[PDB]
Amino acid sequence: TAAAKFEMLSQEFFNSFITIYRPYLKLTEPILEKHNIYYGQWLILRDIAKHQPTTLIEISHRRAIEKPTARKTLKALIENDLITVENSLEDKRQKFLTLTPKGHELYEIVCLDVQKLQQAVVAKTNISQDQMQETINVMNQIHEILLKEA
Ligand SMILES: NC[C@H]1O[C@H](O[C@H]2[C@H](O)[C@@H](O[C@H]3O[C@H](CO)[C@@H](O)[C@H](N)[C@H]3O)[C@H](N)C[C@@H]2N)[C@H](O)[C@@H](O)[C@@H]1O
Ligand SMILES: O=C(O)c1ccccc1O
């Protein structure tokens, strides 16, 4: 349920990359399942790690989600002692978030596995380090038009 829980040339172009996303989650899912953590949770955990100290506000915006799912997910991450909250007396949404030592352990373990899984998939294809630096360039152009719009 880890991947499950997270529930014309141009047509063939957007399809090559927009249809790889779920197989992908289904493949990298066990990595997460092994740390008793879900995708949504994990995506949040990673966001806190790349930008801590951060706050729900900041996280919602960056991640591009709704405070309700962001907040409900943050609570579990907390509930599971993977991130901390600077104890003040402001509103939860404004407080600071940081990974707990536990969370760093987990995070770093997951990171290392994904990288390994990913390096493996490439080593099973004819793709070159050129094709990968060149894919990224096509890709980023698109990712830009999508964000510089939304
Ligand atoms: N808001 C929607 C989000 O959709 C994606 O979901 C991403 C998670 O990061 C991955 O999580 C872990 O598995 C991946 C497999 O390698 C790794 O790439 C990643 N570093 C690991 O953390 C997850 N499995 C799929 C995908 N990567 C983007 O990432 C994120 O930016 C974007 O905003
Ligand atoms: O329950 C919390 O401690 C909490 C903290 C930050 C953001 C949302 C929350 O529910």
Final resolution, Å: 2.9
Report yes or no: 25 and 6 within 8 Å, Cβ to Cβ: yes
Nearest CA to ligand 2 atom 6: 92
Kindly report the CATH number assigned to the domain that includes residue 19.
1.10.10.10
Nearest CA to ligand 1 atom 28: 43
β-strands 83-85, 96-99: how paired? Answer: antiparallel
Report yes or no: 96 and 53 within 8 Å, Cβ to Cβ: yes
Query: What domain range includes position 110?
Result: 1-150
Q: How many domains does the chain have?
A: 1
Ligand 1 touching residue 115 (CB < 6 A): no
Find how far residue 47's CA is from the centre of its chain. Answer: 7
Strands (E), the chain: 54-55, 83-85, 96-99
Buried b (16+ CB within 10 A) or exposed e, 2-39: bbeebeeeeeeeeeeeeeeeeeeeeebbebbeebebbb
Of 19, 16, 22, 20, nearest in space to 3 by CA: 22
Experimental method: X-ray
